[PDB]
């Protein structure tokens, strides 16, 4: 039977992650997801004013920020860019413990 | 591989049950081991002393294929209010 997994779960934080092939979440909160079926998510967003990194659990049967978590079965968080007006937006999901702690932007790093 | 009872205070106490499926369903009373510790998959139910049926807040979580177990908490937990 599916048990809940562990994820970084700081919600939305300001971030200094920028211009890197990978970033650590710098999130000090690891949580067990409320629901067994939830997976980990990281969302990085940059606009003219701020950079944020969001870390949550989320059920991949539901969209998140208007996108489907097609990568939920991955063990690693590989960020994928979504085209959005007025910001640069990257998101990943993954289903190993604390997998949204190690956020990978460059293909080169897996 | 076990978890000690959670520390408590004037705001809170805990009961312990086996995890079933989800954060709502209450399982059997959890059984302590010889060192008075709870086994992996124990579900900790908190009661705020100021106030409610109780709410599960943590699982004694054993990592994947390891022998290390620690309490892991559900998201966004807020402290019980002071009495
Ligand atoms: C980020 As959620 C647990 O409300 O799907
Ligand atoms: C987590 As995805 C496939 O919407 O970048
Ligand atoms: Cl964009
Ligand atoms: Cl476990
Ligand atoms: Na859109
Ligand atoms: Na843009
Ligand atoms: Na973008
Ligand atoms: Na509960
Ligand atoms: Na919750």
Author numbering:
A (entry chain A): 45 to 154
B (entry chain B): 16 to 66, 71 to 102
What did the original publication write about this model?
It differs from the previously described agonist, TGM1 (TGF-β Mimic-1), in that it lacks domains 1/2 that bind TGFBR1. It nonetheless retains TGFBR2 binding through domain 3 and potently inhibits TGF-β signaling in fibroblasts and epithelial cells, but does not inhibit TGF-β signaling in T cells, consistent with divergent domains 4/5 and an altered co-receptor binding preference.
We found one TGM6-D3:TGFBR2 complex in the crystallographic asymmetric unit and interpretable density for residues 46–153 of TGFBR2 and residues 16–65 and 71–102 of TGM6-D3. There is a single large interface between TGM6-D3 and TGFBR2 with an area of 661 Å2. TGM6-D3 engages TGFBR2 primarily through the edge β-strand, β4, and does so through the interface near the C-terminus with the residues anticipated, Ile78 from β-strand 3, Tyr93 and Arg95 from β-strand 4, and Arg38 from the tip of the HVL27. The interface between TGM6-D3 and TGFBR2 is a remarkable mimic of the interface between TGF-β1/-β3 and TGFBR238,39, with a central hydrophobic region flanked by hydrogen-bonded ion-pairs at the periphery. In the central hydrophobic region, TGFBR2 Ile76 inserts into a hydrophobic pocket formed by TGM6-D3 residues Ile78, Tyr80, and Tyr93, mimicking the interaction between TGFBR2 Ile76 and the hydrophobic pocket between the fingers of TGF-β formed by Trp332, Tyr390, and Val392. Though the overall architecture of the TGM6-D3:TGFBR2 interface is similar to the TGF-β1/-β3:TGFBR2 interface, it is about 50% larger (661 Å2 vs. 479 Å2 for the TGF-β1/-β3:TGFBR2 interface) and it has a greater number of hydrogen bond and ionic interactions.
